[PDB]
Design a protein around this ligand. Structure first.
Ligand SMILES: *C(=O)C1([C@@H]2[C@@H](NC(=O)C3CC3)CCN2C(=O)[C@@H](NC(=O)NC2CCCC2)C(C)C)CCC1
Ligand SMILES: [Zn+2]
Ligand SMILES: [Zn+2]
Lengths: 21, 180, 153, 16
């Protein structure tokens, strides 16, 4: 039987930012 | 301040499968909620108190792939439908809620935050009901209070004609209980 | 690829904010007027002009994503400024809320059009104007998100 | 004159 695998993440602690250019 | 979330995909189907089998995951980990998959299924695993938790009905007794090979559960409580591995290196942990608020926020696998009104110890209702397909893959996701603290883990949905109005969840206290 | 829900905008004189809600890029009439918004295919005309409510909207531009309207009726709001600072605002009535922690006037300068978010980060309103007492802002006026919702029919 | 877009803000803090 296979292992559970992380395939992605959700990040809650990021805060509003200006998108860098 | 306000809860906001984003998702990032770190592996595709082929890589996931290989990793499920090798049980070796070398990728770096970030964030409070991990998107996890098995052969048949995808769900969420929330990190609370240094431990990464999810539902038993998805993970079963399965190990989690890690930089050091498979990692065995630290907690397994079938009645509670709860399972937990030590939180991966680099994840961050949620704080259990202590304000007893009734205004809940579910964080979905698409990284949306949706309002939920508490209506019991382990049930809440969606203020804006949603298609069951939208919540697919979201089991194990956290329910936060207005301060972003973990109130519980999304366990199941009450749907009627494919539209979901309420959600059942495992409350944080049951986590702490499981921890003893 | 990363999309923004809030746009930092300019006219020849002023500079302010716009917020995308439901596929429309909304901002304040007192900043935009009836102006068109730029696009790489040439100017784009406003979809909505509501002089009464201080509200204007064009179709959401590229590099944008939309905020969801708040539906939790909460009163703990958060204002986002053009510097990406977040300041808590307690909701007083329909269109007004007070800072939990008052700030010099300039700290909010150029932020009108920006969003007022609830705890879910859903849109409660657009920051309309700073309510000032001698260089210090202790409250804010805003366009309730329902005005935007109704303007759409 | 037109309203020009000078920068963007991502509320979630999502990086490049
Ligand atoms: C959790 O995602 C989900 C689940 C889903 N299980 C999974 O996605 C992975 C964990 C393995 C199965 C569909 N589903 C449900 O909750 C269904 N409900 C259910 O089994 N419910 C009972 C409890 C209260 C009423 C009956 C439901 C039919 C969607 C949560 C939403 C997706
Ligand atoms: Zn709390
Ligand atoms: Zn809300």
């Amino acid at each position: 039987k296979g292992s559970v695998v992380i395939v992605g993440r959700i990040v809650l602690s990021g805060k509003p930012a200006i998108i860098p250019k | 301040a306000p809860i906001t979330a984003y998702a990032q995909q770190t592996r595709g189907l082929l890589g996931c499968i290989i990793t499920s089998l090798t049980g070796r995951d070398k990728n770096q980990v970030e964030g409070e909620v991990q998107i996890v998959s098995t052969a048949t299924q995808t769900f969420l695993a929330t990190c609370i108190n240094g431990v990464c938790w999810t539902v038993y009905h998805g993970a079963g007794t399965r190990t989690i792939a890690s930089p050091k090979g498979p990692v065995i559960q630290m907690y397994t409580n079938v009645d509670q439908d709860l399972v937990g591995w030590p939180a991966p290196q680099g994840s961050r942990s949620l704080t259990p809620c202590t304000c007893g608020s009734s205004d809940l926020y579910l964080v979905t696998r698409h990284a949306d935050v949706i309002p939920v009104r508490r209506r019991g110890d382990s049930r809440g209702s969606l203020l804006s009901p949603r298609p069951i397909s939208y919540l697919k893959g979201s089991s194990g996701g956290p329910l936060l209070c207005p301060a972003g603290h973990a109130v519980g883990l999304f366990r199941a949905a009450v749907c009627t004609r494919g539209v979901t109005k309420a959600v059942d969840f495992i409350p944080v206290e049951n986590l702490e209980t499981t921890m003893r």
